Amino acid sequence: FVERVPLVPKVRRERKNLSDIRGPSTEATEFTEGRFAILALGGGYLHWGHFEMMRLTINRSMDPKNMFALWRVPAPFKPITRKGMGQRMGGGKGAIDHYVTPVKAGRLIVEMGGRCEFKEVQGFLDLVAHKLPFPAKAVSRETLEKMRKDQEERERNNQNPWTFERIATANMLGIRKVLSPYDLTHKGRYWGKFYTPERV
């Protein structure tokens, strides 16, 4: 059970970094113990109500003898602020309404190990995936590695001489004037919070 509010509640309202939802993920990219997971195909903010859903659902859906689950995501640490209704702009920052975990595209939310075949987990994982803020998928190691090998196969099979990398890095057509500084790294595959898998 994850706790609605942190045990040591943050006293000081923090600026909201959009940057921590933005682009590829570093942490929690690889499996540890389990065969299965729910993979995040966009960035997004996970608050308490979601944890509730994934928890009750995935607990009641699984055979406790043959299966076990694990959190790959922390319990929510980031304060979110509101102002009351009917507030004029200004006067200060508001007060703390919420707690959320930032989630970057390419991270595993839940890790399910067990002696089941991927068909079961995929059966009921697709529900919890379908119900998350970002677009999300139900995957295993074989699936993941397959789609990644395909993902670089596309980049070596690409028939048109022009890829986003080549242009953005060579600053051709002064394109760097329209692009962001984070655009060199994302290579134009991520845009804002969204992620496009077909972008080479």
């Binding site: 890095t169 600053n171 051709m172 002064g174 760097r176 004037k177 500084p181």
Partner: protein
Amino acid sequence: KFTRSRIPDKVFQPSPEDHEKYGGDPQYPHKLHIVTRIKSTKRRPYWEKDIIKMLGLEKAHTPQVHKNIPSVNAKLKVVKHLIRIKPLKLPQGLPTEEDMANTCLKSNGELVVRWLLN
């Protein structure tokens, strides 16, 4: 913010087939550039406008000649997306005094020293 950017060296390392493709001679690099300005300096940052004032590229579609030394090459690199660059060729060799009046520059990027006899 917006910035002066950079070009990483890999860009400027030519592949073997680029010689065959642009018809450059693999053994000997070429002496002079003919640089024409294709695009406008408006809507572009001030430092590019500067580079184009130094190169003498002031008005579009007029050719200029420049040395292939690294110093000029640097500036060209900064504005490389506004310009057209072609190697200058001298089939008849270098122009002498007598030929000064008869010089002509063809769109091949080719200088002809003896032009329109009689």
